[PDB]
Design an enzyme around this catalytic site. Structure first.
Site, PDB file in Angstrom:
ATOM      1  CD  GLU A  25     -40.366  17.091   3.951  1.00  0.00           C
ATOM      2  OE1 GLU A  25     -41.174  16.145   3.890  1.00  0.00           O
ATOM      3  OE2 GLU A  25     -40.726  18.280   4.160  1.00  0.00           O
ATOM      4  CB  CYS A  82     -42.663   9.484   1.758  1.00  0.00           C
ATOM      5  SG  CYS A  82     -43.289  10.927   0.915  1.00  0.00           S
ATOM      6  CB  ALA A  86     -35.473   9.622  -1.712  1.00  0.00           C
ATOM      7  CB  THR A  91     -21.179  11.534   4.885  1.00  0.00           C
ATOM      8  OG1 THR A  91     -22.074  10.436   5.100  1.00  0.00           O
ATOM      9  CG2 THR A  91     -20.372  11.779   6.151  1.00  0.00           C
TER      10      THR A  91
END
Ligand SMILES: NC(=O)c1ccc[n+]([C@@H]2O[C@H](COP(=O)([O-])OP(=O)(O)OC[C@H]3O[C@@H](n4cnc5c(N)ncnc54)[C@H](O)[C@@H]3O)[C@@H](O)[C@H]2O)c1
Lengths: 497, 497, 497, 497
Positions: free
Chosen positions: A266, A300, A163, A229
């Site tokens: 995660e 996070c 991320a 993807t």
């Protein structure tokens, strides 16, 4: 007008970056996909450009990674640890400029950009020793003349999707552990931190090439959702480590499960701090402030719900408001700055909508709530009172500095309220009561993967496994026996009679 | 008509079974769903009836199990182990008649029916000691005045779905481990082994009730696909352990991932034995015969592919042919019978279908291939030569005693052929070559969860984790640190300064 | 006139005891040494007689045990565990009469004599699971084509010398763990609990014999200092587990070291309870009472020093004096009796000598201090104030019910005062302070092997290792990885290339 | 006349060495004891001088190290690991010159001097990761509302006495592990390697000073048996690690046991290689040569007995003769050389006497046996055939390159012959037989701490524990859980109810 072309930013060149940089590495550097420009979030200036991966770049890279695995898997684990040790040394030598790049492209403050590189260095050094330790027990067989051995082997190719908000160390945890465990790696970082991804990959590539190892052991394919993807659907990706939003991770988990792969997820957090009446308030207030507004609320593990005993609610809120008003705002690389911009303009927009929704659901903004009128993506860190603990906006992860504050009276109800959300990442209680602390750690306490006492929801160290439960996705990174997720267990019986 | 009403089967009442039996237990016995009659595969006669779970039975049971969890999770693990010890003793006192029931309703021979109960007894005695051991390390924090602790807590409700072919011991592994770990359990067994499920649950229920514990700690909801689908979709089921076919298990895994639940999947096998030129043929011939024809080829670990080096292929096939003719056939519950019926008339038809497809694909039946001319579901154990290793029917899992035989020349190709299938459960090599064995156990060797040397593919022991890789689902049961799958890890930091 | 010939003691015959008993077992029973009579400390009446081991008896028994080892060590560990499980069951069947015997011959109250046998039962049930677990890791070698394996093998003959005050469970701990580890045992119990040693050995021999195993696996040679000195010098005794006084233990440790043997030493204690100003006094007082007065103060873990913060010293002492006056005295086997006799007449003389030395050294006796005017070895539990914390009698381990009470002001001094004695077995603090508890557990805290918080110095459970530091000898028994003390480690490298 | 004053040896100054050096370090450098001159065994010329520790130096140093401990044990273990990491780096920077000093003063060849320093570097890098892992489990208590925790704490001061033949790495092993475990260290090296000890201590002292830590954490007191005996008797030395002769180690162990201290003994070896009829002679020959002649036969793990199956005896001996002839002699620090001198003149007398006793015992010198006619302490490496396995000179450890060859026929006798000596360090078999290998690793196999297959008795890696059984002393250093010997275990019960 590119920042890399200004003498003020010539240090970018110490990372080997230039105007346009190849975003695919597999032993060779390339990239035939779309050229992305990344932007400094503190001033909306463009930094430099990265050539992302085409489908053909991706396909060639997976093939080269799997051929390189044949060599790498035959290297003894302790000798793979030596490679990782050299990666840590090479990161060490660039810690300042790479930390500055994290501040520049991502927008967290400098001590945290440098701190993130340092933590990658530290997980490398830890992995050196772990590479002499991974394995399973030899057990006593119940039958005469048989040996019973638990063996661990690499899974093969480990895809790593990371991320924007920890653009170095998440990859580093996965990379260092997967490598000593005999895997090769394919990284797809966040598109808006492509320079960081390229810079780290340059550092690792040089170590592998100096050791006459195939570069595809640590491959890179910069891209967006299409590459991500493809990795999730790709049967040649034996393990997919994904760090990102719960929404995207749920789809990645489904795609990997559909092909009977392995995933390590995660995902998001909706992390609570609980302050009981006996709490040391001079710990609570600065801890809440740092947990809520550190990294402009984009960890996070960021504290997003603050539960305060009704007896001390008003005093803690008033002290929190005063502390917020003292937060030094500025460019994330400047001295004494503690609070930088949000990562994107879309994040500003999401922050505004959450604040609006919080008012529509009956909350009161007692501090902040506005976009700051200045260059970049700056918003005021915000405190909302008056909502019910089960307000919809409070059960949503909004990746922005908004702290929802709640009253409570008794332990049992507020333990339930910590646990009622879908996320399950971090949690902390502030109390001096011995019993309450162990009940918190116990089966009727916090249901999260990080369960803290008298310390904020953020700040984990590498010695333990890191990750969460429920919609945070269940994966674990870094310490403890987290390495087992990167290997396959076999139970082997040898009849030698 | 019903066997339980005939004098020669009066021993079934020692298990508390009657003509019609309640198939829901949650502290109370009931069942308002569909009544099913189970049949004896040795003679195709009906045994007795079970009233299965309606939807409201399932709903009430789940709610009662979760209330019982609040009591059960507060009992210290060593005290939970004491309950599991008493479960072990209660199975001990019924081992013969329970094993006779397994033989009667499921069709495996008596020593394996008794053996299944014995292994549940052994896992109980194992779990007692484990109950004083489960937990994690206290680690050294990098920060002074902080403790760092890895805690483990129960996940909550553990749903257990089991298959016909191991109708006691699979549940028993999951039950004993989940219990000492502080979870409650909800069991849905195979519909065609419903009497076995009820009889086992009757034994556990008496132990729970005798210890003044709520019976829903070990609940039973007999049913088929609909109850199983409700469990996989139910957010109240925190872990779903599923043992069954790959096709059904894949859908169970996807449903559980859709809700961010936990699953433990133990799916099909396509298990290979490889015999190298230096193998001891007096080990190879009996090991292959037992692994291939044991339980009439209806084990997950049944040997279905036999790879023999060119130089010894004909001799081994000849000795196997002679060995197959010697098998003693009869009613499975009679001592000294070695070969019993297939589980259903459908399985007999699918045996004939597979034999026909094997001939279509070029293979030669060198022994067996036909149904036996006797009452019940008896077929001849079968050997097929001449197929290519990638013949479609060979890569299929057919739950029948059909052994596909292949030739090979070198080690590398036959390791690959072991690995080329989708399943990854068990595997065995027969060889004396030291280097070959460790290579088989290594990263370039067997990709299976059970990797054996000079013994058959079946017959593992509780001290190790049991499970497979790839399309076998990745779950592990019984031994090593398999207990961790039934618990949630938390990484806990206590600032005491 | 022996108690075993009186009708009310006929229950002794259920243990197989007669008027004169054989005190040597090596597969056969015998004993050509001196005959000893043991006496009930509650009335000084003789119970029965035991024929002890001559030198020839010892020689024959060591030789048969080492022959039995050749069979026993070839038995797979889980199968050895099954034997230990049967020992556990056979103890269960005799728990009431064996516990009554502990009360009759040794003098502790009935709940503790029964409780001692239950603990042996529990360690057996623990060992069953441990027997499928012992072993070491398989580690990744740094050299290609090498396996690196840590093996554990039995040491051979484990000699076990035990004390009077725990005449069952100390032997049981050593026996259950040594047995599953593949060792044979030789037991020399305390001479004054010879009947207990014989009775335990009778229960074990019947289990060995019923499993067609050589009885010398669990050999017994009753005797005193001569046999124990012989075991300490015997090179055939691969490990000597000694439980007893520091003075004897030090000479045993030297003899064993002289011959490069292994020793496991469990020696004396001088255990302190510390109560800080913030302590729950409703916990302190009854915890102090049970710790100092339990088993008439004859536990290795008995509290003999009580440190009390000066703010609460008077009140705690006053409430303790009042609680000592409410202690029910009587025959150990009689109901509601909490305080029995001292073990020997000499111990009473030891008690009175210690009291006079305490008063000579400036202490005041605020409760007790006298013999009780009644049959048996009954002395009053005693509380002494006013000694300096470094009085010589206060650093001596007097095995009698004497509690030396001291004041303190600050945490650093009292922690030092706990650690200043030569013993290091058990310790306990009573406090609510979160920081204090973890400092007490850390490197500047207690130096003992058992470090408790808010419970007394006794009552350890089998899941942890039990032992002490400094002059307590350093040995560990029962839980954690104590089993490693009964085995030898080898580091094994297999070059298979 | 001193080598350090000849321009050819100027490189010695890169290690901070001078003509006369201080042999005491405790934060300051000193030494009021006798001044020793160490000599180069390749030419018997003096190198330089070291002022050894007086008694008063020793006292001052112990008191400073124990004061330093109060600071060091408060530093979190991971931060202690960071110091050890920097020690590894500083050794890295001086590996060439330090390795050259090891060759010059001790006499082993350059690649082994460098390799010894490299092994110390590697144990440091291992200890970094280990420093985040040490600890014990949190266990489930059987009592409600109680936590059960296993804590490890430093023992305090670890005294380290090392021998001449591994004058860097043995200290390094003990130092790296003691340090991360929170202890301070006092080092007394072999008098004849005083310069090496000083040079190592200079490297470590700089790191401690740069991190503003008291240098007494790694104290040095150069001296002989007087200092070593003071350490053995000093109650302030909580753990004494001793590497040396069996004769001295036995006295050290008794002195430590006398004061209830802790000892870690690594003593002599009489290591055997067994070559079975099926062995790969391409492996046996160079492995025997390397194991017997490496470091001039002066390793504790040197092969001194070679058992060969009757069938292959003469061929293996003949092949060793040709191999021994290719052995190149010269100054060991020159990178050409493969064979250096013995360490002392007294060692040469030992070589001669042993060769004579062997000849008088009935053996034949088939190669070597004579003093080389050159400056230094050079002896011919020696092969002796014809003795019987129980011949007196074969059971004694002579620290010279003499290889006693014996014939055998059966596996049972030759395993017994391996185990019949007093020492218990290393052992190797050469074979391809699967059952024989696992039998060798089992309870009836080798009785040694190191048990190798198809490799020499020497060259262990740091991943496993290093040490022997029987008269080798039983200590373990370096890998696995050897770190537990440097710490004290406590079992901690916390009642929080
Ligand atoms: N890996 C192992 O441990 C293991 C052990 C035994 C058997 N197996 C495999 O189990 C299979 C045995 O055949 P089987 O016919 O009993 O398997 P199956 O898939 O037909 O049924 C197994 C269980 O799943 C239930 N079920 C069926 N449909 C379901 C659905 N849609 N949703 C939820 N539950 C559903 C069934 O009622 C039954 O209880 C074999 O393939 C064997 O290899 C694996």
């Amino acid at each position: 007008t590119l920042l890399i072309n200004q003498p003020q930013y010539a240090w970018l060149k110490e990372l080997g970056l230039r105007e346009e940089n190849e975003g695919v590495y597999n032993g060779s550097w390339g990239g035939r996909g779309e050229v992305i420009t990344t932007y400094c979030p503190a001033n909306n200036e463009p930094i430099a450009r990265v050539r992302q991966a085409s489908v053909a770049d991706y396909e060639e890279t997976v093939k080269k990674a799997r051929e390189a695995w044949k060599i790498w898997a035959d290297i003894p684990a302790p000798k793979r640890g030596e490679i990782v040790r050299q990666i840590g040394d090479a990161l060490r030598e660039k810690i300042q400029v790479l930390g500055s790049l994290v501040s520049l492209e991502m927008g967290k403050i400098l001590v945290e950009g440098v701190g993130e590189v340092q933590e990658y260095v530290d997980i490398c050094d830890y992995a050196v020793g772990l590479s002499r330790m991974i394995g399973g027990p030899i057990l006593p067989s119940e039958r005469s003349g048989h040996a019973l051995i638990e063996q661990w082997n690499p899974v093969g190719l480990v895809g790593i999707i990371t991320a924007f908000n920890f653009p170095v160390v998440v990859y580093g945890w996965n990379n260092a552990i997967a490598m000593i465990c005999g895997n090769v790696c394919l990284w797809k970082g966040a598109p808006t931190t492509s320079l960081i991804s390229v810079a780290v990959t340059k550092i690792i590539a040089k170590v592998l090439e100096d050791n006459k190892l195939p570069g595809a052991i640590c491959s890179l394919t910069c891209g967006g959702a299409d590459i991500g993807t493809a990795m999730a659907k790709d049967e040649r990706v034996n393990l997919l480590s994904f760090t990102g939003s719960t929404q995207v991770g749920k789809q990645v988990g489904l795609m990997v499960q559909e092909r009977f792969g392995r995933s390590l997820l995660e995902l998001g957090g909706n992390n609570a701090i609980i302050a009981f009446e006996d709490a040391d308030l001079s710990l609570v207030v600065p801890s809440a402030l740092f947990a809520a507004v550190g990294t402009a609320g984009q960890r996070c593990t960021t504290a997003r719900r603050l539960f305060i005993h009704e007896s001390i609610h008003d005093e803690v809120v008033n002290r929190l408001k005063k502390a917020y008003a003292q937060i030094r705002v500025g460019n994330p690389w400047d001295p004494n700055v503690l609070y930088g911009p949000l990562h994107t303009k879309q994040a500003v927009s999401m922050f505004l909508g959450a604040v609006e929704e919080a008012k529509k659901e009956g909350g009161t903004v007692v501090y902040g709530g506005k976009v700051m009128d200045r260059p970049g993506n700056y918003v005021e860190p915000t405190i909302v009172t008056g909502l019910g603990h089960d307000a919809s906006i409070a059960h949503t992860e909004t990746f922005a500095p908004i702290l929802y504050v709640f009253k409570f009276k008794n332990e049992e109800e507020v333990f339930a309220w910590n646990n009622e959300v879908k996320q399950g990442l971090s949690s902390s209680i502030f109390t001096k009561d011995l019993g309450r602390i162990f009940r918190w750690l116990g089966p009727k306490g916090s249901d999260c993967g990080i369960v803290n006492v008298n310390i904020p929801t953020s700040g984990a160290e590498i010695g333990g496994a890191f990750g969460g439960e429920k919609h945070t996705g269940g994966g674990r990174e870094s310490g403890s026996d987290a390495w087992k997720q990167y290997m396959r267990r076999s139970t082997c019986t040898i009849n030698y009679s």
